[PDB]
Design a protein around this motif. Structure first.
Motif: not given
Ligand SMILES: Nc1ncnc2c1ncn2[C@@H]1O[C@H](COP(=O)(O)OP(=O)(O)NP(=O)(O)O)[C@@H](O)[C@H]1O
Ligand SMILES: Nc1ncnc2c1ncn2[C@@H]1O[C@H](COP(=O)(O)OP(=O)(O)NP(=O)(O)O)[C@@H](O)[C@H]1O
Ligand SMILES: Nc1ncnc2c1ncn2[C@@H]1O[C@H](COP(=O)(O)OP(=O)(O)NP(=O)(O)O)[C@@H](O)[C@H]1O
Ligand SMILES: Nc1ncnc2c1ncn2[C@@H]1O[C@H](COP(=O)(O)OP(=O)(O)NP(=O)(O)O)[C@@H](O)[C@H]1O
Ligand SMILES: Nc1ncnc2c1ncn2[C@@H]1O[C@H](COP(=O)(O)OP(=O)(O)NP(=O)(O)O)[C@@H](O)[C@H]1O
Ligand SMILES: Nc1ncnc2c1ncn2[C@@H]1O[C@H](COP(=O)(O)OP(=O)(O)NP(=O)(O)O)[C@@H](O)[C@H]1O
Ligand SMILES: [Mg+2]
Ligand SMILES: [Mg+2]
Ligand SMILES: [Mg+2]
Ligand SMILES: [Mg+2]
Ligand SMILES: [Mg+2]
Ligand SMILES: [Mg+2]
Lengths: 246, 246, 246, 246, 246, 246
Positions: C220, C116-118, B158-160, B155, B163, B165-167, C213, B135, B131, C111
């Motif tokens: 892009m 982590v939400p999980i 859910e681990m966030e 998965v 979000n 990754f750029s795309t 963002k 960034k 993560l 961070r």
């Protein structure tokens, strides 16, 4: 490699499933040996406990005649930490990678993974090692056939390992009165008359007993006086059946 | 970097999705190379298992012609503790930061994170490292393109991480009878007549099989006698389909 | 301290919220500097991911002109154990305590806490260290302003940290077509004509995109041919919107 | 022991609760000093966050005039493992046991126990150490008064610690408009006219703010221009209220 | 062994339960001493917190006149790891085994096991050590009486320890107005007139207070002016009662 | 091996179940000794707590007259880590493998596995070691009989161990008034007249008490005056009964 250790009581042809397992095993061996597209082939032999998975895996490996054959077993890793098991496994695969044609049997996966349904609990580091090793192609040009065995296909599926194997081969328990009698005859344990009686009691009826378990019930029954051996065998078979309600 | 290892059976143009993946990959490479605003660009190639994610990531990286290209794989970290993996990763990124233009492929993220659905369980320290690395901009003026691959977009979301990754670029399985036939033809495995039969059986119908999985089914089918190769292929394809009920 | 690293693309006045954040930040700086009653002041800048929290925190810190300014970031603690992170943090605060007037930025708290939400999962030892440091006054007479940043105010609240900060400052995403156009104009990326088109498509409509963002979507879109840049930008903006149903 | 550190802004008599806390504290000090039956007395000062628990505990300890007075705080144990904290605590109590009359303040118990509601999580080894120390009488003839503080009485109750203390003393937030005005007057912050306005706005109405929190709101309000100080104070007070619905 | 430490305020005969506990204790001592069939006897003294379990256990042990008597307490194992506690316990039992007739008191089992209801959490290694030690007979011919104490019989039952003890002895709180007055009289704290008043207020009514807790309430009440001592005592007793609704 | 230690009060024939257990044990010993098919035989003696499992296992082992007999007990592994227990076990089996005919008793499996129902919790590494050892045949030609004991068959079943044993033998508590009287008579504890009274009170009625527990109740009853011994015994028996509602 000592196969006698893993095939202590031979490979008797009690039914067509035995031939199917061996024939499908040979097809995978042939593919591993002749394919350039899939130098890495993996197969999971799975079935009920005591159905004969380890012996059949060892037999398929033996019949491959590969220059490198190694069986990875829980036997010499008792008390091993996750890391220690991973290192032992990496060693086996690393040696296999040095051979042009190799076969590695990963026996009793649920035990290698320290699995227990309560929790459940298991060694994830070992699971992860296997997931990677099952997908790792040997050095370019070299071939490897991985044969795993388990009595818990359901668990491996949930762990997403079942999807890591190229295919799976079902190793069923003896399932018919005829297959049972064939096994007894090939094992040659009861008197000609005693088998007729057993046949009378089981023919037409469904059975569900693993070959390894059958060996045990036979020996237990033989400890009885001659007049009580058949009665004992049938009583034990009655207790080692499949639950009609699950 | 050895791409042959990650692109063992080429990159065949079985359908438009292949071109889309490569073209979008090149756009990101171009952006990374020419943008001052976004010196750090990251993309996640995701899709079903065996869809060809790793090979395509390696291909995008290869086509970038970047002076520094490194693929981070689970292969050489089997049995590694969380800390050991983090250090191995930091090393790769640190080296990348020394280059003016670099590309790092973080392959099979679910495996790097020691993920298993039961629990679930995973290496959070490794997740946290990723993560942060996803960034972190390289030293001022230097550029970095990070390409990750996964078969578990859900998965990662859910681990966030999704979000972070750029795309993302979807790498689908072969999905139509026409794409399937195109793959077979490009791979040139069956006899002209056998493909006509297969086309007859699949054309118009939906399919869902990953290119890597297709390679395996083909090789298995080729182990059969000539008269049974097509029957075997179709039977295997029938078992490797998508569940209509999920 | 290198701010250029944390404010890579300046601080553009895209809307009133930017001025609000900076003005409230200066009020806290003034309070920290002139108050004898509250020598320790802490503020949490929070908002959606990519809204510009880190850059604004760095800007508030820079504008304080304090003799001691240090930014605590996850960047140099990748792979660090809980204890190692705590020690790194204690070091920063200990140094701050030696200054008569200091500002410490605790960046990306989720961070730093390995959240982590999980599970969820997180480093409690680090959380506890922060809870204590946020309430610890510097040596008598010395002053300290702590500025934290997070994209997860909800989580910090549940951890009872939100109650440890003196106050919080919301850092919103660009939320109106007008603020969006202002950002584009200040960033000066599209042709005068292209912005008129974008304005036509967004004016009056609601938007929800973080400044960081937005920078990525712009770059892009610029990789497209001139005739397709606006179409691409609007399509990307359409995908980076807020869920009407959540 | 440095009390100035724990009583940075004095002990103002904003209301009767302050006198109650101090008087009950002195009764416990007297009991500890004169009783042969209960040589060990423990009391838990508890209330909402920021209500003034630590300062009052330090004040009770200071007023005891005991030859041995030590405050155990989370401040110098940041990053400490459970074992390290236990050893630090054992050291303090061991030293106390060497004195004929001692007072030990165990401050911010939830922090000493590394408590977090998510899970929840906490250091059980430290909890167990406290449960034993709270019940351990000093060497025969020697006396010890233990004063703990917490903002989480509910949690300590669930941990069965509340039952380990001899008694508890509630330290409430300022709860009436009159107590609020008394605090402001004693703190002497607003102009005579400004307090009349505040009184007009709060008199008769209920309030719920901790003395420590009040100090912060005052300082924030004072950063405003003279004409806006009262408006700011009232707005902040409005946000720092108790939830009517919980 | 120092009993004065564990029986700081004697053993007053406030009611028949006290005699019952001591008499049943002596019967177990006699059995341990004279039985060849049960050389190992164990008993768990259990009751509400503060009911006097430790003092009574120490008294039973003292009255045994056994050549070896040792009390295992949490007091000198604060901060001890599970392994360290197990070793400390093994040491005590090993020494006991060297004596022909021994008594070991395992005091405050919930504390020895690091028990906390939240989770719950506890030291299983220590629990397992106790389960084994409670069932281990001393060397042939030697005798051992183990006396455990706890305020949490319910928890020990759930841990399956309650079934490891030979028997259990309930140590109740003072439960009637008459037993309360008897305790006060034996402790000789209030003036003849004050006890008449207390008797007037409690006689016929139910009470539920542990002897140790009663000592504390008495001392607290004595800190009041003569005219307010009884009022204070009754008010405290009113707060230390049993919940009618649980 | 010292059996006197494990059979402290003999093996009295209180009922037919005792003979059944011993006879079935001898059949397994005979099978282990004479079978070539099943050189490895394992049996689990299971029943309620105190039913006499350990003593019977030791008796079966003693009657085997095997050159190698070893009892693996929790007694000398108190405080042992999982790894330490595994090593201790591997040592015992390794020594057994060096003998042509061996018997290993794995006593009190729930204790060896550090089992506790709360959680539950247990040592999985030890469980895994046992699962492997229970299925591992000694070197070719050598024989081994493994006898395990447990009061928790249900738990072992859930751990999938019950399926690892060749068979199981139920060791019931004394269940009828007649078996109870037989036990008393064989133990010869009460006067001829007292047993007639007991018989009058229990004959025809159901009972459920383990032989080991019966020994304890007898000794407790004998501490009473002659006139009260029977009353005491019956009262204790009344408390040590099986719950009609569970
Ligand atoms: N057709 C057969 N297939 C397999 N095993 C056979 C066959 N005929 C005889 N056997 C013997 O039966 C035994 C099978 O044991 P094994 O291969 O360990 O079973 P398993 O299913 O692997 N056991 P488990 O892992 O405990 O479920 C061996 O002694 C084999 O030699
Ligand atoms: N168009 C294509 N895209 C991707 N791979 C292709 C293509 N054409 C052929 N291949 C080959 O197909 C294989 C794809 O394997 P790989 O890239 O490992 O798949 P994957 O989806 O990453 N696998 P997994 O990580 O196991 O889900 C490689 O041998 C490629 O060379
Ligand atoms: N008004 C502004 N406020 C904040 N950042 C701005 C502004 N104008 C331009 N920027 C730039 O936008 C970027 C914001 O990135 P950053 O401050 O890292 O966002 P963030 O919200 O902290 N990110 P994350 O922690 O990933 O949610 C930086 O390059 C800034 O220089
Ligand atoms: N009557 C009073 N009681 C307590 N503190 C007071 C009083 N009057 C002024 N103060 C000051 O108010 C502050 C109270 O802070 P403190 O004692 O740390 O609160 P707390 O409730 O222990 N905080 P926390 O542990 O964060 O909930 C100190 O600066 C005191 O000097
Ligand atoms: N009849 C009595 N039984 C027990 N203790 C008594 C009795 N009479 C007086 N005492 C005193 O009361 C106190 C009892 O304390 P203790 O034995 O520690 O209680 P406990 O129930 O073990 N406490 P806890 O473990 O905290 O629940 C000691 O000081 C005893 O000397
Ligand atoms: N027929 C019998 N079977 C078993 N034990 C007997 C018998 N007759 C007398 N005993 C004695 O009764 C006691 C049984 O204790 P033990 O064998 O430890 O029971 P257990 O069921 O293993 N106990 P636990 O493990 O605590 O449930 C020993 O002292 C035996 O000598
Ligand atoms: Mg097997
Ligand atoms: Mg891949
Ligand atoms: Mg940020
Ligand atoms: Mg405080
Ligand atoms: Mg006690
Ligand atoms: Mg036993």
């Amino acid at each position: 490699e000592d196969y006698a250790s893993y095939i202590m009581n031979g490979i008797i042809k009690w039914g067509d499933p035995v031939t199917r397992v061996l024939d499908d095993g040979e097809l995978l061996v042939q593919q591993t040996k002749n394919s350039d597209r899939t130098p890495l082939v993996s197969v999971l032999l799975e079935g009920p406990p005591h159905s004969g998975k380890t012996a059949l895996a060892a037999k398929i490996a033996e019949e491959s005649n590969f220059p490198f054959i190694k069986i990875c077993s829980p036997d010499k890793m008792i008390g091993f930490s996750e890391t220690a098991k991973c290192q032992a496994m990496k060693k086996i695969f690393d040696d296999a990678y040095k051979s042009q044609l190799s076969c590695v049997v990963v026996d009793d996966i649920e035990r290698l993974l320290d699995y227990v349904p309560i929790g459940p609990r298991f060694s994830n580091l070992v699971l992860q090692a296997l997931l990677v090793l099952l997908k790792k192609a040997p050095p370019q040009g070299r071939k490897l056939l991985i044969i795993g065995t388990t009595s818990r296909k359901d668990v491996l599926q949930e762990m997403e390992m079942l999807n890591a194997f190229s295919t799976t081969i079902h190793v069923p328990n003896i399932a018919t009165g005829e297959q049972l009698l064939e096994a007894l005859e090939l094992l040659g344990n009861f008197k000609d008359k005693e088998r007729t009686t057993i046949a009378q009691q089981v023919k037409g009826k469904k059975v569900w007993i693993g070959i390894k378990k059958l060996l045990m019930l036979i020996e237990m029954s033989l400890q009885m006086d001659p007049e009580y051996r058949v009665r004992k065998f049938l009583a034990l078979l009655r207790e080692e059946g499949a639950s009609p309600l699950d």
